[PDB]
């Protein structure tokens, strides 16, 4: 899944 600070 995407990292805590992604997007």
């Amino acid at each position, epitope marked *: *899944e*995407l*990292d*805590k*600070y*992604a997007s």
Partner: antibody
Amino acid sequence: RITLKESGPPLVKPTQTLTLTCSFSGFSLSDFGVGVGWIRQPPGKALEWLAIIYSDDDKRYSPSLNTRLTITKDTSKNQVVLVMTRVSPVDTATYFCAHRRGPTTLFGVPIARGPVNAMDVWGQGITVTISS
Amino acid sequence: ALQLTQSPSSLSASVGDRITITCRASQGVTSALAWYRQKPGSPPQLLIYDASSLESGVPSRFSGSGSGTEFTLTISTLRPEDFATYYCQQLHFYPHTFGGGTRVDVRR
């Protein structure tokens, strides 16, 4: 100045449970968005990411080791513990814990996330050998 | 999962050379990539964070560029302490992968 240091048994036998402790100073696991992760390095091999835990208590694990890892924090003691169950010889490695910055804030407002993209301070590493 | 491939895996050089190590990701990782230098017997040390930002206290001969799937670390003037193994790390997707490393040794 941030410093971290790993502690635990240097030797462990197959099928046993390994508990590693990361004690740190210079930051609190209650600080905004901070993380502490664990990375291992079998002798002569590459670094391998294991897990990380943040101050808001979100936890993430390597999918390959998910079933054998538990990471937890003890905020008031400034420690992060990683428990690995059912170890086998391939788990012999040097284990490092490391700090991960949270976003920079301005008057308590997150304004920069670039600093979270790295594990910026590492502990010396603790060598663990798994053999019966 | 996501793959991070470093090139070259090994590289020979001499003091004063300019070297560049590259790291390619199987899917885009935006700018969430870090470079480290690890000397024998020591923990890895952060050189560059967020693909190109110079970490505080790190000498200016180190430079990082790129985003997406291709990144490069260049050391402009190799010093003796740079004979070591370098690693890149992706932090966009879990798990936070490391590349295989590239060993930089004394050419002869």
